Design an enzyme around this catalytic site. Structure first.
Site, PDB file in Angstrom:
ATOM      1  N   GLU A 196       0.858  -1.167   0.000  1.00 12.33           N
ATOM      2  CA  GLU A 196       0.000   0.000   0.000  1.00 12.33           C
ATOM      3  C   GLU A 196       0.903   1.227   0.000  1.00 12.33           C
ATOM      4  O   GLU A 196       0.744   2.143  -0.816  1.00 12.33           O
ATOM      5  CB  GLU A 196      -0.872   0.026   1.258  1.00 12.33           C
ATOM      6  CG  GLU A 196      -1.844  -1.127   1.389  1.00 12.33           C
ATOM      7  CD  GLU A 196      -2.806  -1.239   0.212  1.00 12.33           C
ATOM      8  OE1 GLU A 196      -2.903  -0.292  -0.595  1.00 12.33           O
ATOM      9  OE2 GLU A 196      -3.480  -2.278   0.102  1.00 12.33           O
ATOM     10  N   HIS A 233      -9.120   1.973  -8.580  1.00 10.12           N
ATOM     11  CA  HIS A 233      -7.734   1.741  -8.959  1.00 10.12           C
ATOM     12  C   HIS A 233      -7.615   0.929 -10.236  1.00 10.12           C
ATOM     13  O   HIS A 233      -6.643   1.076 -10.983  1.00 10.12           O
ATOM     14  CB  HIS A 233      -6.983   1.041  -7.825  1.00 10.12           C
ATOM     15  CG  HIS A 233      -6.890   1.862  -6.579  1.00 10.12           C
ATOM     16  ND1 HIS A 233      -6.104   1.504  -5.505  1.00 10.12           N
ATOM     17  CD2 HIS A 233      -7.503   3.018  -6.227  1.00 10.12           C
ATOM     18  CE1 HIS A 233      -6.241   2.401  -4.545  1.00 10.12           C
ATOM     19  NE2 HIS A 233      -7.085   3.330  -4.959  1.00 10.12           N
ATOM     20  N   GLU A 277      -2.574  -5.547  -8.613  1.00 11.24           N
ATOM     21  CA  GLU A 277      -3.898  -5.402  -8.020  1.00 11.24           C
ATOM     22  C   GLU A 277      -4.935  -6.274  -8.719  1.00 11.24           C
ATOM     23  O   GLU A 277      -5.639  -7.048  -8.073  1.00 11.24           O
ATOM     24  CB  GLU A 277      -4.345  -3.932  -8.070  1.00 11.24           C
ATOM     25  CG  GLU A 277      -3.344  -2.952  -7.456  1.00 11.24           C
ATOM     26  CD  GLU A 277      -3.758  -1.487  -7.602  1.00 11.24           C
ATOM     27  OE1 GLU A 277      -4.263  -1.106  -8.684  1.00 11.24           O
ATOM     28  OE2 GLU A 277      -3.561  -0.711  -6.642  1.00 11.24           O
ATOM     29  N   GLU A 302      -3.960   4.986  -1.361  1.00  7.82           N
ATOM     30  CA  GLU A 302      -2.896   4.122  -0.882  1.00  7.82           C
ATOM     31  C   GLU A 302      -2.378   4.620   0.465  1.00  7.82           C
ATOM     32  O   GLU A 302      -1.765   3.865   1.223  1.00  7.82           O
ATOM     33  CB  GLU A 302      -1.764   4.023  -1.907  1.00  7.82           C
ATOM     34  CG  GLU A 302      -2.198   3.593  -3.317  1.00  7.82           C
ATOM     35  CD  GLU A 302      -2.997   2.283  -3.373  1.00  7.82           C
ATOM     36  OE1 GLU A 302      -3.224   1.778  -4.497  1.00  7.82           O
ATOM     37  OE2 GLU A 302      -3.406   1.763  -2.314  1.00  7.82           O
ATOM     38  N   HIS A 355      -4.950   3.120   2.750  1.00  8.73           N
ATOM     39  CA  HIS A 355      -4.721   1.687   2.878  1.00  8.73           C
ATOM     40  C   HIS A 355      -3.519   1.355   3.737  1.00  8.73           C
ATOM     41  O   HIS A 355      -3.520   0.345   4.449  1.00  8.73           O
ATOM     42  CB  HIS A 355      -4.573   1.060   1.499  1.00  8.73           C
ATOM     43  CG  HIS A 355      -5.780   1.240   0.634  1.00  8.73           C
ATOM     44  ND1 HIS A 355      -5.842   0.783  -0.662  1.00  8.73           N
ATOM     45  CD2 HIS A 355      -6.968   1.838   0.882  1.00  8.73           C
ATOM     46  CE1 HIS A 355      -7.018   1.090  -1.178  1.00  8.73           C
ATOM     47  NE2 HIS A 355      -7.720   1.732  -0.260  1.00  8.73           N
ATOM     48  N   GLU A 382     -10.426  -0.042  -4.251  1.00  9.34           N
ATOM     49  CA  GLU A 382      -9.686  -0.684  -5.334  1.00  9.34           C
ATOM     50  C   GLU A 382     -10.447  -0.792  -6.650  1.00  9.34           C
ATOM     51  O   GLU A 382      -9.850  -1.065  -7.691  1.00  9.34           O
ATOM     52  CB  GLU A 382      -9.175  -2.060  -4.882  1.00  9.34           C
ATOM     53  CG  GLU A 382      -8.072  -1.977  -3.814  1.00  9.34           C
ATOM     54  CD  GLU A 382      -6.776  -1.335  -4.322  1.00  9.34           C
ATOM     55  OE1 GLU A 382      -6.063  -0.712  -3.505  1.00  9.34           O
ATOM     56  OE2 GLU A 382      -6.460  -1.462  -5.527  1.00  9.34           O
TER      57      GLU A 382
END
Ligand SMILES: [Co+2]
Ligand SMILES: [Co+2]
Lengths: 167, 510, 388, 72, 388
Positions: free
Chosen positions: B97, B229, B192, B127, B130, B226
């Site tokens: 992260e 992302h 990811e 991030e 996270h 995510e």
């Protein structure tokens, strides 16, 4: 004796050595020598493998401090610790890199640039501008037809000594 | 004179216009690619709205953790093995992260279209959230759990073991060192998309099954971010598809990224899942094939074919070496248990059945080995035995892949048993596969990571552990343990008595 | 089904009993404080510190790192993932910095979220209250739309100046502070556009297109030097500390403060504009929050470093001189805007007095901290030359 | 100096007592046999804003646990 | 102990097993919507309504009640706990009202809490930014301290006028709105004092004591009619609806709106005062919030009651008239304040324009809703007949 990961005789030995570098030219020359002797896959020796990264940093701290005291403001921003014009060095190296005929030639140019001009030798702004340009060309040359050369031939190109193989 | 306002989309409508032209308006990083400055982003967010949607998630998350879950004693009522697994799972993911923060800052710099920069910017911020979320999981288990050690200092005790080195390759250096696009691949397109997202969901599954409701609360919240992302990974490919360079280098950087990620997670995730739990959710074998082969290397990767993207050429080998990977690695991780920051356990009788059942042949190989280590007293502090000794006695040298940092024992492994040893300018180098070897041969200067045997060479085991603070608050009991029981915990002295001195296995070669 | 098919170890009788049985009689270590090994900045370790310090996997060769050895994968050429080579500044420990506001992600988005929701309420109350009726049309259509608007590009550029730092910062505490300083800048740029979008909804004929303020920014005279300075700060600086330092302790501290506080915040109210000041209030709040972090990193940690104090001050004094000139030029060009105002709005004395406030604040909060010998009257005199 | 400054609930509450003034009909509208002293103090020195905040925080945890973990 | 001595039915294997064993296979009723029997104001029932409507135990004899029978315990004499006898207004159902903003306790404190925390951040930025340096010293030491301060007692008195309504309201939806309308009022009064307390901290010599602003309120001339209007609305009115209506659809809609919006919010900016407006932004956001609530109750529900529309409008027109006078009187007395302003602050032309804004917004937002025939010119004329 005194061994250890973060503290040992080798590191102490270099701290003492560095403590005696009291002029910019002498200190800068030692840092450059150190980089030739202990960094990159082309280092002259792997004897300081476990401590060179740390010792280099300590050497850098000294060159930096000495440079700031010796250089006027204009030179601190635009000259290398060796008195060279940073822009000229940067442009000349980039020019050389753009003329490179292949990835082998190009890697030597990039790696040597780092060994010789990494801060505090060259001002950070010029050095990272160099990283930007040299890295691009190096990658362009290297990543072209990346898998075409068989491992048997690549080993020969790299010039490694194949010690042991099994499969 | 009616109540009126302005929302995010209404402002975002003009965000692409925020960037302006000037000679030096260009990325500061080296790259073979050119991101189109017209590239758009999927979510029309602005800073204020981004903060609000995330704050709402935090509210629910911390509310559960601080109130209901704490009242339920959720930090304690978790299976011991899983309390240990989360020390590694949460802290290792934390660094991924964390490095994704820098990685996306680099992509933000790379992007020239204001909207694409903005997309990466939201990830930079995510991030950071996270990182703090993974930090909080370790933080919570240390404060209210059955064994705080490791959870409370993983950021420094992680440095003792070999498993940490590989984590940095795929989730640290792999995310930020190289062509911005190469990094994007390791991070978003592969990292990811293929492993992280699927892993996050899976972890909440295994966690819940082992009594852990802490991780699901946090990780399920991470998961909601995510989704955005993914769009960043997709837009990266889109922003460079029309650039001639793309046809030349995209599939190579992608293939390299795939191998890099797969090399570490294929064996490590399976190991933490199957060996780090009491109650199993699904055999790693089928989980892997679905994730990597079916969902990613087929469905996801296929949809990008329209941009020139192809299936990783190394996908076949990856699958071939996958089957026993995690099994081969746990043997090493357990043999080297004194170098971790967590407690490990031998498979129990019931587990061996599950293993043998789901992996025909497991017992005759690994099963027997563990039974002998058990017999040799590996769990007993007075035995004076550490599985590492067994490897020495039976001449099974453990090497560290110069590129991936993944430990391997070719003379014992049931999976890949390939070993390549090269000498170059005065240094020895050991590789476990043809893809990593290629990487090193072409890019020697990118892979100079010294391994644990090189650093610890000639060092007595207890001294390394003590120096790197591998002890509990009593200053004598080791953090790591060869068993997860609460009694008979090994001490630094038990290790010193073994007089185990590290040696670099590659030195044997002439 | 009502109960579901998934059995949970915390509630499932059979599984829970298995778990409870394997549990120890008590914790295997009484030290339940994650991050206990971190040197606390304050009385006791804070959540901010615990969740942040040492998240960055630096090895000991990068001042303060606790790991060992080289990175596992570096850039083609050999450049390290993170390295000392990315900044001229040196220190005994990059992890020493502490955001005085102790902002980790949760607190950060919480406060901004509160600001977002209240902004919406304020706007709905503003529109419904018809307060726009008393705003001078010329101030609204020319100075807010064109000149305040063009300033969004200044803030947008300063935001982008942070991109490289987000990648190169040498510690977690510094990366988080930098990220937040940059994020607040883009927020302001977006709030400037937000106000323009709002005005377009309550004022018939008001065009929210950014075309006009962008043309002012890219081709006007008032912001010419400002733009030139911003383009440099952003794209010509490859040193993440020179970037953050020069942006926050030189350019934005002088030019930024003057434009936001001494021009718009100061004059808008005179034209019946309580709308723009609502947003400038946010900008100044953000400015003062970032200032605390900037001072802690550059003065408390770097400029006062036990081993590199003198060295860092020399470097920062160097940067101040390098960026002060472009900053003065930016302020000088901006002086041209005063001639565009309706007669009697303000005068040379007020303008000069306001220049001194900004310069004096800058000397006290920044210049003096590194022994930079700034001459207040010489700076102001140089800027005043710009009064058309 | 320009030190970051603010004001808290206690600081405003200190003057809350004087908020009421004497006048004509200033008395209860409800029948009662007792007389509550107009000098009576309250234990918690709060203002509407602080009250709202301390309660908002509790709501946060409560509903968070309810909508998230407990529902799961 | 690590596990604690208390066993919980949700996690204890033994107890949980017993519980699970007693559970039905599926819910014993598929209707899982609490308040399902409530008539939705909008498309689908809202949480606001579900949690609020019918909480009040009214029997069918109180328009809308769902219960039956007399109250269990009443007042000595026979007065009911709640009864039709506490208000002149009549309706087909007292539960019809709906706060347009759908505010139950949670959303309510969340919003005010955001405002509180942002206010604190603002003050810390404002002081650190030294924005007080450009504020007119007279405006601060005389108009903000004395005249703005004195207005706190107006708001305070309006807050207290809600006490009886808190007790007599005939429904939950109405009780909640009333409580919030009054709470926002005391908030405002406390915000006025907060500013004065803020000034005292950053402006040496500034006395935060309420002595000055109180004396002005109690014995002054500017707010005399204002105070008289307040004392009557509060302590002389015994009909909870007349109180709410008169205070929000008459008095505060005219006098209050003028003072806050047309005087301070309008003039403060001319003396380099963005501080006071920051707080008035709140008061006005609140006013506009409450207005929607007031309009929905007295017009949408009562004024437009399918059976008492005509009756209620009569009663309100009656109240409008009864209080329109004391209000106008309050406005005339206030005019005398302009005479204390430094020369050049404002002219009679601006004032007339501000009055008409208030009067016109009032007619459009209130008076016209109950067909009250107001004369904009006559009202403005009457008020203006009190200038210097
Ligand atoms: Co993430
Ligand atoms: Co992500």
């Amino acid at each position: 004796a005194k061994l250890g990961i973060h503290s040992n005789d080798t590191r102490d030995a270099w701290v003492n050595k560095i403590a005696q570098l009291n002029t910019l030219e002498k200190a800068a020359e030692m840092l450059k020598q150190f980089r030739m002797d202990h960094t990159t896959p082309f280092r002259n020796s792997y004897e300081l493998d476990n401590d060179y990264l740390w010792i280099e940093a300590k050497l850098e701290e000294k060159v930096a401090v000495l440079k700031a005291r010796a250089f006027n403001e204009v030179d601190f921003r635009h000259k290398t610790a060796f008195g060279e014009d940073a822009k000229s060095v940067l442009d000349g190296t980039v020019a050389k890199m753009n003329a490179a005929k292949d990835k082998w030639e190009a890697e030597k140019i990039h790696i040597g640039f780092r060994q010789a001009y990494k801060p505090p030798i060259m001002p950070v702004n010029y050095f990272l501008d160099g990283e930007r340009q040299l890295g691009t060309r190096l990658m362009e040359l290297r990543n072209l037809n990346y898998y075409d050369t068989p491992l048997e031939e690549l080993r020969k190109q790299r010039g490694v000594r194949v010690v042991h193989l099994q499969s | 004179r009616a109540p009126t306002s302005v929302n995010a989309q209404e402002v975002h409508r003009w965000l692409q216009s925020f960037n302006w032209d000037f000679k030096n308006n260009r990325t500061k990083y080296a790259t073979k690619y050119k991101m189109a400055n017209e590239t758009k982003e999927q979510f029309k967010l602005i800073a204020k709205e981004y903060a609000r949607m995330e704050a709402v998630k935090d509210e629910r998350q911390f509310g559960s953790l601080q109130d209901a879950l704490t009242r339920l004693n959720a930090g304690v009522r978790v299976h011991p093995k899983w309390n240990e697994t989360m020390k590694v799972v949460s802290n290792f993911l934390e660094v991924g992260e964390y490095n994704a923060i820098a990685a996306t800052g680099m992509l933000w710099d790379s992007a020239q279209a204001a909207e694409q920069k903005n997309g990466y910017l939201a990830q930079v911020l995510d991030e950071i959230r996270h990182t703090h979320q993974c930090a909080y999981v370790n933080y919570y288990f240390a404060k209210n759990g059955q064994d705080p050690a490791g959870h409370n200092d993983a950021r420094r005790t992680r440095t003792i073991g070999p498993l940490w080195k590989g984590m940095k390759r795929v989730f640290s250096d792999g995310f930020i060192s190289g062509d911005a696009v190469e990094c994007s691949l390791n991070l978003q397109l592969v990292g990811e998309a293929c492993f992280t997202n699927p892993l996050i969901v899976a972890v909440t599954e295994w966690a819940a099954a082992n009594g852990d409701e802490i991780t699901p609360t946090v990780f399920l919240s991470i998961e909601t971010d995510e989704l955005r992302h993914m769009a960043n990974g997709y837009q990266t490919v889109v922003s460079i598809a029309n650039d001639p360079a793309s046809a030349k280098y995209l599939n190579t950087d992608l293939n390299n990224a795939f191998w890099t990620q797969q090399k570490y997670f294929t064996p490590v995730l399976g190991m933490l899942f199957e060996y780090g739990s009491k109650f199993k959710v699904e055999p790693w074998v089928k989980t892997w094939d679905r994730w990597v082969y079916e969902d990613w290397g087929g469905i996801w990767i296929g949809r990008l074919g329209k941009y020139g993207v192809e299936s990783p050429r190394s996908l076949k080998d990856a699958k071939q070496d996958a089957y026993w990977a995690h099994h081969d690695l746990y043997l090493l991780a357990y043999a080297l248990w004194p170098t971790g920051f967590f407690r490990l356990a031998l498979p129990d009788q019931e587990e061996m059945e599950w293993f043998e059942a789901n992996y025909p042949g497991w017992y005759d190989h690994y099963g027997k080995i563990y039974e002998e280590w058990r017999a040799r007293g590996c769990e007993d502090p007075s035995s004076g035995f550490i599985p590492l000794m067994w490897f020495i006695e039976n001449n099974h040298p453990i090497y560290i892949d110069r590129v991936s940092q993944v430990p391997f024992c070719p003379s014992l492994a049931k999976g890949a048993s390939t070993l390549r040893v090269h000498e170059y300018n005065g240094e020895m180098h050991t590789f476990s596969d043809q893809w990593g070897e290629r990487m090193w041969l072409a890019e020697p200067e990118r892979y100079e990571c010294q391994n644990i045997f090189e650093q610890y060479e000639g060092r007595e085991l207890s001294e390394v552990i003590a120096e790197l603070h591998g002890l509990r608050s009593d200053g004598k009991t080791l953090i790591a343990q060869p068993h997860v029981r609460g009694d008979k915990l090994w001490t630094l002295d038990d290790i010193k008595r073994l007089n185990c001195v590290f040696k670099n296995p590659v030195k044997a070669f002439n | 089904s009502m109960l579901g098919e998934r059995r949970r170890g915390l509630t499932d009788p059979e599984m829970a009993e298995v778990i409870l049985k394997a549990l120890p009689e008590a914790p295997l270590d009484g030290n339940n404080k994650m991050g206990y090994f971190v040197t606390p900045r304050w009385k006791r370790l804070t959540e901010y510190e615990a969740l942040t310090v040492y998240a960055q996997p630096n090895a000991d060769w990068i001042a303060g790192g606790l790991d060992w050895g080289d990175w596992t994968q570096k850039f083609h050429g050999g450049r390290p993932s993170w390295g000392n080579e990315t900044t001229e500044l040196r220190t005994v420990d990059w992890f020493k910095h502490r955001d005085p506001l102790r902002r980790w992600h949760a607190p950060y988005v919480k406060d901004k979220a509160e600001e977002w929701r209240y902004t919406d309420r304020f706007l709905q109350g503003y529109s419904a209250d018809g307060q726009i009726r008393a705003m001078n049309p010329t101030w609204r259509d020319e100075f807010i739309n064109r000149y305040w608007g063009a300033f969004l590009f200044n803030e947008y550029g300063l935001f982008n100046a942070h991109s490289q730092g987000a990648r190169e910062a040498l510690s977690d505490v510094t990366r988080v502070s930098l990220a937040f300083w940059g994020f607040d800048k883009i927020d302001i740029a977006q709030m400037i556009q937000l106000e323009r979008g709002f005005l377009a909804k309550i004022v018939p004929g008001f065009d929210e297109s950014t075309a006009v303020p962008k043309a002012e920014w890219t081709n006007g005279e008032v912001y010419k030097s400002a733009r030139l300075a911003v383009e440099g700060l952003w794209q010509e600086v490859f040193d993440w500390n020179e970037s953050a330092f020069s942006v926050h302790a030189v350019y934005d501290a002088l030019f930024g403060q003057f434009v936001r506080r001494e021009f718009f915040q100061r004059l808008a109210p005179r034209f019946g504009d309580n709308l723009t000041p609502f947003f400038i209030n946010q900008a100044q709040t953000y400015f003062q929050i970032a200032k605390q972090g900037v001072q802690d990193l550059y003065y408390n940690c770097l400029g006062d470093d036990p081993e590199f104090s003198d060295y860092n001050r020399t470097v920062m004094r160097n940067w101040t001189g390098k960026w002060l000139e472009p900053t003065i030029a930016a302020l000088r060009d901006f002086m041209g805007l005063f001639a565009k105002l309706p007669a009697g709005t303000t005068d040379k004395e007020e303008i000069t007095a306001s220049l001194y406030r900004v310069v004096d604040d800058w000397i006290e909060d920044y210049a003096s901290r590194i022994d930079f010998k700034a001459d207040r009257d010489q700076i102001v005199k140089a800027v005043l030359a710009g009064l058309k | 100096n320009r030190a970051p400054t603010s004001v808290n609930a206690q600081e405003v509450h200190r003057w809350l007592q004087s908020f009421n003034w004497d006048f004509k009909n200033n008395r209860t509208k409800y029948a009662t046999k007792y007389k509550m002293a107009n000098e009576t103090k309250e234990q918690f020195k709060l203002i509407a804003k602080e009250y709202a905040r301390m309660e908002a925080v509790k709501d946060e945890r409560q509903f968070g646990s309810l909508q998230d973990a407990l529902t799961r």
